[PDB]
């Protein structure tokens, strides 16, 4: 059993962050412990093997340490490229339950705050004949996280909404988000004003269109 | 021999 | 010097999943090989390991429903899983360990193969592609963001390029979402100057052998 704490941690650019890994039982020879970096949508990457030996091509600002039941990964001089989830893997034997993965630690890198630019896209003309329309609202290049609200003629929408967020940009730490509102073609044709509200703490950006005009 | 066959 | 997982795709609950780990540029024989999966928004999960010297070992949850086999003739390692459920929907990885002395220093990872076990419909579906353009009533500016909505496909994935790969900068392709019907939906946008020619999004859905080109023009009224 490998316990990783914390599950998530935010770290300013340039600062140092430490990721903890708790093995319920000492790994074999006190050193069978590897660290991995995984960005969303990508395969894992080996960072460190045997507690503290850096894999080839891994910068020296990554430092592995520990022994027995307790191990640490230290990342100094954090850059946006380090936004990822980090995993420890411990090995005891070549038997049942004889290696274990940590639950992972998500490292959010805090860059400069950026307010989102918000775009709304009315449904293409050939959507409505299908009986269903999807309205897309995009929030581009923002940090920190946002919440999206949909309104149809002032009425807040509570169903038919899907949200999808890109991973932190490896250069400037920002996110992109796509929000979709799905309605029946008749619901769409029965209403006029369609609104997407992107809120970022105390800031809000609102984009609307009127069906008649598009 | 539970350590990778050794 | 890379490993690759064989094709996953769309499965019904109660089906059997069979995956093969293949190597190119080096050998799998004599090197440890591991199988790991990752459910959407969850951590890496060990499925089982093929020891470098013949031993096969699993986590307890997998020992009943997973079996892992090495083929030294074909230089492959395979994974078979029975009694699939929607919970088995995940990306499946295989990986190779260069040095046995590291035990878990797993070095070369495959790109991952997507396995969708759908509770709602086991039948594949080609995507519809719809242009994303600002309301025609809007005043034009020097910059404009256009895109394509790739709606209603099954299973995953689709890939999107713009202008046959010549337009790459300012492209934001979002992760897929699953509609209430069980169908998947992906969106991609690109920012260009208003002097731009019309942009064409290239959508590939390998599971249906489909490629769709959609040319998006800014509407004007
Ligand atoms: C497997 O072991 C070899 C031998 O130790 C590793 O090769 C070394 O890699 C380090 C960098 O991590 C270099 O500093 C050494 O000079 C390399 N030595 C030789 C002889 O090439 C190799 O990286 C290890 N691979 C894994 C995946 O653990």
mmCIF file of C-alpha atoms in Angstrom, chain A:
data_model
loop_
_atom_site.group_PDB
_atom_site.id
_atom_site.type_symbol
_atom_site.label_atom_id
_atom_site.label_comp_id
_atom_site.label_asym_id
_atom_site.label_seq_id
_atom_site.Cartn_x
_atom_site.Cartn_y
_atom_site.Cartn_z
ATOM 1 C CA UNK A 1 0.000 0.000 0.000
ATOM 2 C CA UNK A 2 1.426 3.329 -1.182
ATOM 3 C CA UNK A 3 -0.198 6.464 0.233
ATOM 4 C CA UNK A 4 0.556 9.741 -1.551
ATOM 5 C CA UNK A 5 -0.111 13.058 0.189
ATOM 6 C CA UNK A 6 -1.331 15.524 -0.625
ATOM 7 C CA UNK A 7 -3.688 14.660 -3.485
ATOM 8 C CA UNK A 8 -3.172 18.151 -4.936
ATOM 9 C CA UNK A 9 -0.846 21.096 -4.353
ATOM 10 C CA UNK A 10 -0.485 24.517 -5.986
ATOM 11 C CA UNK A 11 3.023 25.972 -6.272
ATOM 12 C CA UNK A 12 4.109 29.400 -7.592
ATOM 13 C CA UNK A 13 6.513 29.498 -10.520
ATOM 14 C CA UNK A 14 10.087 29.453 -9.243
ATOM 15 C CA UNK A 15 9.203 27.993 -5.838
ATOM 16 C CA UNK A 16 10.010 24.485 -4.601
ATOM 17 C CA UNK A 17 7.451 21.713 -4.049
ATOM 18 C CA UNK A 18 7.729 18.401 -2.186
ATOM 19 C CA UNK A 19 5.630 15.302 -2.918
ATOM 20 C CA UNK A 20 5.316 12.621 -0.237
ATOM 21 C CA UNK A 21 4.970 8.855 -0.655
ATOM 22 C CA UNK A 22 4.126 6.529 2.256
ATOM 23 C CA UNK A 23 4.822 2.807 1.820
ATOM 24 C CA UNK A 24 2.901 0.703 4.350
ATOM 25 C CA UNK A 25 5.793 -1.783 4.072
ATOM 26 C CA UNK A 26 9.437 -1.087 3.251
ATOM 27 C CA UNK A 27 10.294 -1.685 -0.398
ATOM 28 C CA UNK A 28 12.774 -4.429 -1.224
ATOM 29 C CA UNK A 29 16.390 -3.603 -0.317
ATOM 30 C CA UNK A 30 15.091 -0.194 0.896
ATOM 31 C CA UNK A 31 15.528 1.219 -2.624
ATOM 32 C CA UNK A 32 13.006 -0.282 -5.102
ATOM 33 C CA UNK A 33 11.125 2.980 -5.611
ATOM 34 C CA UNK A 34 10.503 4.954 -8.814
ATOM 35 C CA UNK A 35 8.917 8.340 -9.558
ATOM 36 C CA UNK A 36 6.798 9.143 -12.617
ATOM 37 C CA UNK A 37 5.446 12.289 -14.277
ATOM 38 C CA UNK A 38 2.178 12.129 -16.233
ATOM 39 C CA UNK A 39 0.477 15.008 -18.056
ATOM 40 C CA UNK A 40 -3.182 14.505 -19.063
ATOM 41 C CA UNK A 41 -3.532 12.620 -22.335
ATOM 42 C CA UNK A 42 0.105 11.450 -22.340
ATOM 43 C CA UNK A 43 1.867 8.273 -21.186
ATOM 44 C CA UNK A 44 3.778 8.344 -17.891
ATOM 45 C CA UNK A 45 7.427 9.375 -17.955
ATOM 46 C CA UNK A 46 10.108 7.875 -15.720
ATOM 47 C CA UNK A 47 11.760 10.570 -13.586
ATOM 48 C CA UNK A 48 13.770 8.734 -10.911
ATOM 49 C CA UNK A 49 14.657 5.107 -10.230
ATOM 50 C CA UNK A 50 16.190 3.546 -7.113
ATOM 51 C CA UNK A 51 14.947 6.345 -4.823
ATOM 52 C CA UNK A 52 17.298 9.028 -6.098
ATOM 53 C CA UNK A 53 18.936 8.205 -9.469
ATOM 54 C CA UNK A 54 17.681 10.559 -12.176
ATOM 55 C CA UNK A 55 16.607 9.034 -15.470
ATOM 56 C CA UNK A 56 18.534 10.282 -18.489
ATOM 57 C CA UNK A 57 17.444 13.715 -19.682
ATOM 58 C CA UNK A 58 15.710 14.615 -16.396
ATOM 59 C CA UNK A 59 16.856 17.993 -15.001
ATOM 60 C CA UNK A 60 18.738 18.029 -11.707
ATOM 61 C CA UNK A 61 16.102 20.259 -10.083
ATOM 62 C CA UNK A 62 14.197 17.003 -9.560
ATOM 63 C CA UNK A 63 15.463 15.321 -6.380
ATOM 64 C CA UNK A 64 14.341 11.974 -4.978
ATOM 65 C CA UNK A 65 15.008 10.926 -1.395
ATOM 66 C CA UNK A 66 13.829 8.651 1.398
ATOM 67 C CA UNK A 67 14.123 5.106 2.723
ATOM 68 C CA UNK A 68 12.078 2.466 4.502
ATOM 69 C CA UNK A 69 8.425 3.480 4.442
ATOM 70 C CA UNK A 70 8.749 7.127 3.450
ATOM 71 C CA UNK A 71 9.909 8.804 0.228
ATOM 72 C CA UNK A 72 9.948 12.348 -1.165
ATOM 73 C CA UNK A 73 10.164 14.014 -4.578
ATOM 74 C CA UNK A 74 11.435 17.617 -4.566
ATOM 75 C CA UNK A 75 11.070 19.898 -7.594
ATOM 76 C CA UNK A 76 13.038 23.143 -7.321
ATOM 77 C CA UNK A 77 12.638 26.205 -9.554
ATOM 78 C CA UNK A 78 9.202 25.108 -10.721
ATOM 79 C CA UNK A 79 8.179 26.079 -14.255
ATOM 80 C CA UNK A 80 4.828 25.754 -16.017
ATOM 81 C CA UNK A 81 6.235 22.690 -17.808
ATOM 82 C CA UNK A 82 6.121 20.871 -14.447
ATOM 83 C CA UNK A 83 2.314 21.015 -14.231
ATOM 84 C CA UNK A 84 1.472 17.301 -14.072
ATOM 85 C CA UNK A 85 0.492 14.473 -11.752
ATOM 86 C CA UNK A 86 3.391 12.686 -10.060
ATOM 87 C CA UNK A 87 3.377 9.041 -8.971
ATOM 88 C CA UNK A 88 5.564 6.811 -6.830
ATOM 89 C CA UNK A 89 5.800 3.060 -7.450
ATOM 90 C CA UNK A 90 7.197 0.686 -4.817
ATOM 91 C CA UNK A 91 8.314 -2.910 -5.380
ATOM 92 C CA UNK A 92 8.555 -5.644 -2.736
ATOM 93 C CA UNK A 93 8.682 -8.929 -4.683
ATOM 94 C CA UNK A 94 7.545 -10.662 -7.866
ATOM 95 C CA UNK A 95 4.356 -11.964 -6.239
ATOM 96 C CA UNK A 96 0.700 -11.109 -5.664
ATOM 97 C CA UNK A 97 0.164 -7.497 -4.520
ATOM 98 C CA UNK A 98 3.946 -7.179 -4.570
ATOM 99 C CA UNK A 99 4.161 -3.738 -6.154
ATOM 100 C CA UNK A 100 1.935 -0.734 -5.611
ATOM 101 C CA UNK A 101 1.196 2.625 -7.212
ATOM 102 C CA UNK A 102 0.671 5.776 -5.221
ATOM 103 C CA UNK A 103 -2.615 7.560 -5.745
ATOM 104 C CA UNK A 104 -0.763 10.447 -7.400
ATOM 105 C CA UNK A 105 -0.231 14.101 -6.525
ATOM 106 C CA UNK A 106 -1.546 16.764 -8.898
ATOM 107 C CA UNK A 107 0.834 19.740 -9.071
ATOM 108 C CA UNK A 108 -0.827 22.967 -10.219
ATOM 109 C CA UNK A 109 1.744 25.626 -11.148
ATOM 110 C CA UNK A 110 0.659 29.200 -10.378
ATOM 111 C CA UNK A 111 1.701 31.631 -13.098
ATOM 112 C CA UNK A 112 0.505 35.157 -13.720
ATOM 113 C CA UNK A 113 -3.289 35.472 -13.381
ATOM 114 C CA UNK A 114 -4.959 35.925 -16.768
ATOM 115 C CA UNK A 115 -8.625 36.704 -17.361
ATOM 116 C CA UNK A 116 -10.334 34.558 -20.018
ATOM 117 C CA UNK A 117 -11.345 35.734 -23.451
ATOM 118 C CA UNK A 118 -14.809 34.283 -24.022
ATOM 119 C CA UNK A 119 -16.302 33.205 -27.352
ATOM 120 C CA UNK A 120 -19.820 31.961 -28.085
ATOM 121 C CA UNK A 121 -20.708 30.015 -31.234
ATOM 122 C CA UNK A 122 -24.346 29.689 -32.359
ATOM 123 C CA UNK A 123 -25.284 26.350 -33.947
ATOM 124 C CA UNK A 124 -24.358 25.894 -37.592
ATOM 125 C CA UNK A 125 -27.298 26.189 -39.978
ATOM 126 C CA UNK A 126 -27.329 22.439 -40.686
ATOM 127 C CA UNK A 127 -27.585 21.475 -36.997
ATOM 128 C CA UNK A 128 -31.237 22.420 -36.505
ATOM 129 C CA UNK A 129 -32.617 19.995 -39.117
ATOM 130 C CA UNK A 130 -31.174 17.118 -37.064
ATOM 131 C CA UNK A 131 -33.615 17.945 -34.251
ATOM 132 C CA UNK A 132 -30.843 18.849 -31.790
ATOM 133 C CA UNK A 133 -28.599 21.924 -31.540
ATOM 134 C CA UNK A 134 -25.354 22.363 -29.594
ATOM 135 C CA UNK A 135 -24.160 25.828 -28.546
ATOM 136 C CA UNK A 136 -20.431 26.141 -27.813
ATOM 137 C CA UNK A 137 -18.845 28.616 -25.386
ATOM 138 C CA UNK A 138 -15.040 28.786 -25.209
ATOM 139 C CA UNK A 139 -12.945 30.420 -22.468
ATOM 140 C CA UNK A 140 -9.388 30.820 -23.778
ATOM 141 C CA UNK A 141 -6.064 31.346 -21.993
ATOM 142 C CA UNK A 142 -7.011 31.875 -18.366
ATOM 143 C CA UNK A 143 -5.760 31.251 -14.834
ATOM 144 C CA UNK A 144 -7.012 30.492 -12.258
ATOM 145 C CA UNK A 145 -10.024 28.204 -12.757
ATOM 146 C CA UNK A 146 -13.426 29.460 -13.937
ATOM 147 C CA UNK A 147 -17.087 28.501 -13.583
ATOM 148 C CA UNK A 148 -19.498 28.647 -16.541
ATOM 149 C CA UNK A 149 -23.200 29.560 -16.372
ATOM 150 C CA UNK A 150 -25.687 29.247 -19.249
ATOM 151 C CA UNK A 151 -28.799 31.415 -19.627
ATOM 152 C CA UNK A 152 -31.632 31.195 -22.165
ATOM 153 C CA UNK A 153 -33.832 34.319 -22.096
ATOM 154 C CA UNK A 154 -32.490 34.957 -18.600
ATOM 155 C CA UNK A 155 -33.319 31.467 -17.289
ATOM 156 C CA UNK A 156 -30.302 29.631 -15.878
ATOM 157 C CA UNK A 157 -29.795 26.248 -17.539
ATOM 158 C CA UNK A 158 -29.395 23.228 -15.262
ATOM 159 C CA UNK A 159 -29.229 20.348 -17.768
ATOM 160 C CA UNK A 160 -27.676 19.545 -21.121
ATOM 161 C CA UNK A 161 -24.282 21.069 -20.268
ATOM 162 C CA UNK A 162 -20.859 19.471 -20.770
ATOM 163 C CA UNK A 163 -17.517 21.061 -19.866
ATOM 164 C CA UNK A 164 -14.008 20.153 -21.020
ATOM 165 C CA UNK A 165 -10.762 21.782 -19.852
ATOM 166 C CA UNK A 166 -7.327 21.561 -21.451
ATOM 167 C CA UNK A 167 -4.285 20.889 -19.245
ATOM 168 C CA UNK A 168 -2.115 23.754 -18.049
ATOM 169 C CA UNK A 169 -0.139 25.263 -20.903
ATOM 170 C CA UNK A 170 3.465 24.126 -20.564
ATOM 171 C CA UNK A 171 4.696 27.669 -21.356
ATOM 172 C CA UNK A 172 2.378 30.086 -19.500
ATOM 173 C CA UNK A 173 0.353 27.807 -17.139
ATOM 174 C CA UNK A 174 -3.041 28.856 -18.569
ATOM 175 C CA UNK A 175 -6.136 26.723 -19.206
ATOM 176 C CA UNK A 176 -8.644 26.592 -22.036
ATOM 177 C CA UNK A 177 -12.220 25.436 -21.454
ATOM 178 C CA UNK A 178 -15.028 24.372 -23.788
ATOM 179 C CA UNK A 179 -18.645 24.436 -22.594
ATOM 180 C CA UNK A 180 -21.522 23.026 -24.649
ATOM 181 C CA UNK A 181 -25.268 23.510 -24.223
ATOM 182 C CA UNK A 182 -27.403 20.929 -26.032
ATOM 183 C CA UNK A 183 -31.072 21.646 -26.758
ATOM 184 C CA UNK A 184 -33.798 20.320 -29.003
ATOM 185 C CA UNK A 185 -34.239 22.218 -32.259
ATOM 186 C CA UNK A 186 -37.633 23.439 -31.051
ATOM 187 C CA UNK A 187 -36.366 24.743 -27.705
ATOM 188 C CA UNK A 188 -33.754 26.651 -29.701
ATOM 189 C CA UNK A 189 -36.330 28.100 -32.109
ATOM 190 C CA UNK A 190 -38.648 28.994 -29.198
ATOM 191 C CA UNK A 191 -36.174 31.384 -27.528
ATOM 192 C CA UNK A 192 -34.148 34.441 -28.509
ATOM 193 C CA UNK A 193 -31.176 35.248 -26.243
ATOM 194 C CA UNK A 194 -28.435 32.705 -25.510
ATOM 195 C CA UNK A 195 -25.826 33.632 -22.917
ATOM 196 C CA UNK A 196 -22.656 32.088 -21.473
ATOM 197 C CA UNK A 197 -21.205 33.586 -18.274
ATOM 198 C CA UNK A 198 -17.582 32.827 -17.360
ATOM 199 C CA UNK A 199 -16.771 33.742 -13.751
ATOM 200 C CA UNK A 200 -13.215 33.936 -12.355
ATOM 201 C CA UNK A 201 -13.401 34.853 -8.680
ATOM 202 C CA UNK A 202 -14.590 38.465 -8.699
ATOM 203 C CA UNK A 203 -14.394 38.849 -12.506
ATOM 204 C CA UNK A 204 -17.067 37.785 -15.002
ATOM 205 C CA UNK A 205 -17.054 37.808 -18.809
ATOM 206 C CA UNK A 206 -20.414 37.391 -20.555
ATOM 207 C CA UNK A 207 -21.015 36.615 -24.236
ATOM 208 C CA UNK A 208 -24.474 36.442 -25.802
ATOM 209 C CA UNK A 209 -26.151 36.147 -29.166
ATOM 210 C CA UNK A 210 -29.736 36.612 -30.305
ATOM 211 C CA UNK A 211 -30.899 33.728 -32.517
ATOM 212 C CA UNK A 212 -32.665 36.129 -34.890
ATOM 213 C CA UNK A 213 -29.350 37.832 -35.675
ATOM 214 C CA UNK A 214 -27.294 34.744 -36.567
#
